[PDB]
Design a binder for this molecule. Sequence first.
Ligand code: ZN
Ligand code: ZN
Length: 78
Amino acid sequence: GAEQLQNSANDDNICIICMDELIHSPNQQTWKNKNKKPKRLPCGHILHLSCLKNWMERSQTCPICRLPVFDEKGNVVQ
Ligand SMILES: [Zn+2]
Ligand SMILES: [Zn+2]
């Protein structure tokens, strides 16, 4: 908070969490470890699965649109 390094953009191929490349081929695996697989959200966003988890441990939300995503467990119910 209160600290920026000019980084303030929106991407569809980059995990804003760490600003690392995030995308995958339809029949090839751009990333070896499945830990950072392109996990897509219900709202329509994609973040590295590991980074998404790291963020959700502190705030279960989309750090992009701020919408209320599913619980840290991945399956909210009421
Ligand atoms: Zn990431
Ligand atoms: Zn979202």
